[PDB]
Amino acid sequence: SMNPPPPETSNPNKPKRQTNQLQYLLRVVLKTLWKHQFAWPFQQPVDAVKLNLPDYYKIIKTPMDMGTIKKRLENNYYWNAQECIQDFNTMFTNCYIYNKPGDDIVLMAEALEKLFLQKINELPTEE
Numbered sequence: 001s002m003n004p005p006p007p008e009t010s011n012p013n014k015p016k017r018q019t020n021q022l023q024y025l026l027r028v029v030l031k032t033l034w035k036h037q038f039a040w041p042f043q044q045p046v047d048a049v050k051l052n053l054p055d056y057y058k059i060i061k062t063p064m065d066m067g068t069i070k071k072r073l074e075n076n077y078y079w080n081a082q083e084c085i086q087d088f089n090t091m092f093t094n095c096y097i098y099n100k101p102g103d104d105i106v107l108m109a110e111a112l113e114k115l116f117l118q119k120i121n122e123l124p125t126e127e
């Protein structure tokens with residue numbers, strides 16, 4: 001019933017690089033999803049105490065949310081775009097695994113994932 005510590009967003013010993021795909025992931029992908037009318041449930045870790053979801057972290061073992069992804073993109077945590085794409089996919093999958101079909105939260109994730117998939121389809125070639 002308690003919340004875990006949040007995912008890691010800072011690790012000085014992880015090697016980092018600034019690349020055009022990672023810049024696209026922040027400037028196009030994250031920003032597009034973050035401003036959406038359905039973004040709010042995904043802008044921060046699930047607070048299972050205040051939301052009264054005592055079994056959430058019993059089921060979800062790799063929590064992920066766009067607040068964590070945003071901080072990671074600010075902190076160069078991902079060496080490559082596939083790592084950040086994986087974090088978005090984990091966020092959507094957690095929602096589909098935990099909830100029931102047709103719940104509001106699932107409809108919201110699906111609308112964000114539709115936009116995510118379209119933006120990833122146009123991920124630029126590495127420079």
Ligand SMILES: CNC(=O)c1[nH]c(C)c2c1CCCCC2=O
Nearest residue numbers: 040041042046051095098099105
């Ligand atoms: C403010 N955040 C929410 O309301 C929120 N965010 C997520 C990803 C969920 C919830 C509660 C609905 C059911 C659980 C769920 O997956």
